[PDB]
Amino acid sequence: EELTTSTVKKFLIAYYTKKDLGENRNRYEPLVTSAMYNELVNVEKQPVNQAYKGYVVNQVLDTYKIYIDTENNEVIVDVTYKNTQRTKRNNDEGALKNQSNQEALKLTFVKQGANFLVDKMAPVTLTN
Amino acid sequence: EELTTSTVKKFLIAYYTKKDLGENRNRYEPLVTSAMYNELVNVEKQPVNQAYKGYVVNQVLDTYKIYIDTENNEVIVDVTYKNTQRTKRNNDEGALKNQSNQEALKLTFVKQGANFLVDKMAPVTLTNELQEEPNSYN
């Protein structure tokens, strides 16, 4: 009926927690529409992201604020996440661990069968 | 117990529906903390805003989207409001009516007694236009 914070949190965990670029596709696939999945994969294929495959690794969701608009199933999320930046692929020598990062997004959910799925995602800015 | 959309809406009406600058102070004062009230009045006294006193009038809240973080008592609001824009001050002759405007805010509420009060307010940007290109560094 109503979109709950539990559903949003499950998506944030899958979307922000990954060993490497693309390693979480199988875990966010059941939580998003087919259109959204294709869009997320195409974002991963952009040069700015492909460039760091194997170099930015072991990323985990750290903190989150979830702001739900229950009348249109839109959500604002304000997240921090931590990762390791390696200097050499597959090698932890020289790596910077536990590097903090911040991002805010607007998510649109749709009901598809029994489940709420992410159908749209856009960046927003919550700072000043 | 939990911050509700009814509480947020009551503040939005008090903050956005006014006949002129400062005219709504008595309606939003009980809905905000003492510190917030003083900040709001000082923002109103800035020459940026005082310049439109007597020109921008008959303002009404129109559409609103209310995003509530019930764990942190924080709210994002995305609002449209309509007003009349006068060409000559204190005179409706030649004014533009039903002019649309948009604003998005982050509101921080505190529970003071049994009531939720606005304690902080900050602008945010939620729109497509201002954001990044996808193949860009954050």
Side-chain angles (χ1 to χ4, degrees):
Chain A
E1 180 29 55
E2 206 179 85
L3 174 66
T4 71
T5 191
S6 180
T7 296
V8 176
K9 181 180 171 160
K10 286 175 193 144
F11 171 72
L12 296 183
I13 289 167
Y15 181 68
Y16 283 100
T17 307
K18 59 188 170 191
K19 299 181 186 176
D20 199 5
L21 186 68
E23 182 268 342
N24 57 336
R25 283 175 191 176
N26 69 301
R27 299 185 274 109
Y28 65 68
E29 190 171 22
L31 309 181
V32 305
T33 65
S34 308
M36 181 81 276
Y37 179 80
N38 293 340
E39 188 172 308
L40 292 177
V41 168
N42 280 323
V43 170
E44 294 184 359
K45 290 171 169 177
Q46 289 170 352
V48 75
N49 295 315
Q50 287 290 306
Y52 292 90
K53 179 181 193 160
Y55 293 96
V56 176
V57 296
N58 295 339
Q59 185 172 288
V60 186
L61 178 67
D62 183 27
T63 74
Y64 52 90
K65 305 192 180 78
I66 292 165
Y67 306 79
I68 300 177
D69 180 353
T70 54
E71 320 228 29
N72 67 352
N73 300 324
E74 286 182 0
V75 185
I76 301 291
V77 299
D78 191 351
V79 159
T80 64
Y81 57 98
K82 297 192 169 187
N83 51 36
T84 295
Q85 302 172 20
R86 288 179 170 150
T87 60
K88 299 173 295 291
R89 283 181 103 140
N90 298 316
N91 194 328
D92 274 325
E93 183 185 330
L96 295 180
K97 294 187 174 159
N98 302 303
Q99 301 297 288
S100 184
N101 315 80
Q102 182 272 342
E103 184 167 71
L105 306 171
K106 184 191 307 176
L107 307 174
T108 309
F109 287 79
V110 299
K111 193 74 160 267
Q112 185 176 120
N115 316 292
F116 277 113
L117 304 180
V118 180
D119 188 48
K120 297 191 193 318
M121 171 191 302
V124 302
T125 307
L126 304 180
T127 61
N128 184 227
Chain B
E1 183 221 4
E2 214 180 55
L3 181 57
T4 66
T5 187
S6 50
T7 301
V8 179
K9 182 179 167 175
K10 183 174 186 176
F11 173 75
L12 293 184
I13 292 167
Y15 185 76
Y16 282 109
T17 301
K18 59 186 181 185
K19 283 163 41 152
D20 195 356
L21 182 76
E23 188 267 325
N24 56 335
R25 288 180 187 164
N26 303 137
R27 299 194 290 289
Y28 65 64
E29 180 182 4
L31 310 186
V32 307
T33 65
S34 312
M36 181 82 265
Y37 183 72
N38 293 332
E39 178 176 330
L40 288 175
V41 168
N42 280 331
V43 169
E44 291 180 354
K45 304 273 162 223
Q46 294 168 6
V48 201
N49 290 311
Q50 294 283 146
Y52 290 94
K53 175 153 62 165
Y55 289 96
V56 183
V57 302
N58 300 336
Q59 182 173 295
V60 56
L61 175 65
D62 184 15
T63 74
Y64 48 89
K65 300 153 95 170
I66 293 171
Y67 309 78
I68 299 176
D69 173 0
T70 57
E71 172 92 10
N72 293 295
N73 298 323
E74 287 167 5
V75 178
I76 306 309
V77 297
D78 193 347
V79 168
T80 65
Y81 56 97
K82 293 187 292 183
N83 53 22
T84 296
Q85 283 153 27
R86 285 168 178 165
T87 57
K88 176 169 121 51
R89 196 210 309 271
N90 305 316
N91 175 19
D92 292 322
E93 188 250 13
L96 312 85
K97 315 193 102 142
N98 283 327
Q99 295 288 95
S100 212
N101 312 76
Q102 189 273 343
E103 190 168 60
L105 300 177
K106 173 156 69 193
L107 308 176
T108 304
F109 286 82
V110 298
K111 175 51 94 44
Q112 177 180 307
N115 310 92
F116 291 102
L117 304 178
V118 178
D119 189 47
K120 312 185 153 292
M121 176 177 335
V124 302
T125 172
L126 308 177
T127 60
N128 167 220
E129 284 129 4
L130 274 281
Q131 305 313 326
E132 225 171 64
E133 312 283 300
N135 189 31
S136 305
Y137 282 94
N138 295 320

